């Protein structure tokens, strides 16, 4: 508690590199 | 008698007396007979205030003793954990090796200091050197039998430094001083954790403005690039760090610059809905059409989030309402399938067409009647969408209801006066979707129509 964010996986998962990159364009295709 | 007292002092913990003979004059380097200077003599005893107050008047963190041993040494020596965290915080050499060829690790290891043992690997503490008898921490500690630091150190092995680097912590902390002491021993502002991250970016993502101009009058990069194209403007826009933004952009912050999926800090800004972040860039020149890999434009992201505001705004400086992405989705067809229908009442109040096609086909209204959104039908319907609209596979939005089952959009599809009795490219009418999926309801409603 209130030292995790020391590490690297903890600002690594914090900073949120997912939220800068375009994650999908979905259509769900309605035919199989 | 002077430098003495204030080796006394420092010894005992009296940081009023040791700050008054700083105060006075004295050399805040001098040392002992045994070369032990006050940080030496405030590791050993566990003074963590005096420690950092030293540290501030710009004690030589390195300085040996006669036997060799930094201010680390002592610290690990004595078990004193908060001490040892304390002066790693400050850039203290975590492998630094004396005389003899001890390390820090070497004596937490043969003492049994277990806390720091663990700190000290966590920090990138090297268990391979060996001493000039060819002994290694691990080695010591079996040899004393101290069991938990032997199973520490194997367990372990070679995981390297897992802790951010220092002026990574100090920047999260907006911690100035520790900030300062660190870029005064290594004047490195751009120092590079394990994801490639400066310490700027850090201070940008929880605006620590202070920590920022730091390290941006120390020479840090205002437009570093990883590997991953993520500006420290791209982290400011993202979360929403208006005086961050301000405060980079006055600093040469380039408007343009794109990340790996090709995403300007405007469309960051327009993503998470950051209405004065937006009209900041925009006024600074950002491009609004800009587009990432799939074609998105920041109205696209805008109008994803259910950033009303934000799609206001960037109408407002002319933004493309039916911009297109690479599979023909309008800002419209992103409303309506998210469902967000006080962002495509506005999109439909300012323009926006609302019979787009998509790649296959696809209306705003046949999106809408997909995913059971009906305020966005009842709003298209309003606004002139055509409710007999098909599309390449000849689908009616009452086809996309009745398949996906969706009872309020079948009824107030047949209220306006849809035809059930339509057929797609085979011959297949609302009902047989409804029959084919199952939907008893639906297919109940279509039979007291006509179909």
């Given amino acids: 508690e209130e030292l995790q964010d020391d590490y690297e996986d903890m600002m690594e998962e914090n900073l949120e590199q997912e939220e800068y990159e375009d994650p999908d364009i979905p259509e769900s295709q309605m035919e199989e | 008698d002077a430098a003495t007292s204030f080796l006394r002092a420092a010894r005992s ?4 007396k040791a700050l008054d003979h700083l105060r006075n004059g004295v050399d805040i380097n001098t040392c002992n007979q045994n070369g032990l200077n006050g940080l030496h003599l405030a590791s050993k005893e566990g003074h963590v205030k005096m420690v950092v107050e030293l540290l501030h008047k710009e004690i030589i963190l390195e300085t040996t003793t006669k036997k060799g041993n930094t201010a680390l040494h002592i610290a690990a020596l004595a078990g004193q954990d908060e001490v040892v965290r304390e002066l790693v915080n400050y850039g203290a050499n975590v492998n630094a090796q004396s005389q003899k060829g001890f390390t ?8 049994n200091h277990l806390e720091v043992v663990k700190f000290l690997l966590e920090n990138g503490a090297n268990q391979n050197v060996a001493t000039e008898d060819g002994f290694t921490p691990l080695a010591v500690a079996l040899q004393q039998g101290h069991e938990n630091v032997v199973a520490h150190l194997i367990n372990y092995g070679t995981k390297g430094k897992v802790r951010l680097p220092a002026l990574h912590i100090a920047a999260r902390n907006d911690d100035t001083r520790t900030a300062a002491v660190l870029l005064q021993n290594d004047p490195n502002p751009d120092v590079l954790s394990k994801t490639g991250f400066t310490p700027l970016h850090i201070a940008a993502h929880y605006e620590n403005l202070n920590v920022a101009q730091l390290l941006l009058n120390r020479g840090a990069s205002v437009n570093f690039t990883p590997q991953n194209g ?49 009209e900041i860039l925009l006024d600074h020149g950002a491009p609004i059409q800009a587009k990432t890999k799939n074609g998105l434009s920041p109205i696209h992201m805008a109008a994803q989030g259910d950033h009303l505001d934000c799609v206001r705004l960037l109408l407002q400086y002319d933004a493309e309402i039916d911009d297109i992405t690479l599979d023909h989705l309008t800002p419209l067809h992103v409303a309506a399938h998210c469902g967000h229908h006080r ?7 300012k323009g926006a067409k609302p ?22 039908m009842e709003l298209l319907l309003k606004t002139g969408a ?41 011959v297949e009418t609302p009902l047989h979707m409804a029959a084919r999926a199952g939907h008893t309801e639906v297919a109940k409603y279509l039979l007291q129509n006509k179909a």
Avoid: W
């Avoid at chain 2, 820090?104 to 003492?111: D, G, I, R």
């Avoid at chain 2, 980079?248 to 004065?276: F, Y």
């Avoid at chain 2, 055509?386 to 689908?395: F, K, M």
């Fill in chain 2, 230 to 278: 993520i500006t420290p403007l791209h982290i400011a826009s993202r979360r929403g760090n208006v005086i961050m933004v301000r405060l980079l952009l006055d600093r040469g912050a380039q408007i343009e610059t794109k990340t790996k999926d090709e995403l300007t800090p405007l469309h960051c800004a327009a993503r998470n809905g950051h209405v004065r972040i937006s």
């Fill in chain 2, 355 to 376: 019979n787009s096609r998509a790649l296959n086909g696809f209306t705003p209204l046949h999106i809408a009647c997909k995913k059971n959104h009906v305020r966005v």
């Fill in chain 2, 343 to 349: 962002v495509a009442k506005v999109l439909l109040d």
């Fill in chain 2, 104 to 111: 820090p690790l070497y004596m937490a290891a043969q003492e």
């Fill in chain 2, 13 to 16: 913990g009296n940081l009023d």
């Fill in chain 2, 386 to 426: 055509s409710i007999d609209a098909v599309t390449e596979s000849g689908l009616t939005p009452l086809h996309v209801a009745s398949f996906m089952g969706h009872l309020p959009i079948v009824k107030n599809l047949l209220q306006r006066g849809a035809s059930p009795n339509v057929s797609n490219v085979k």
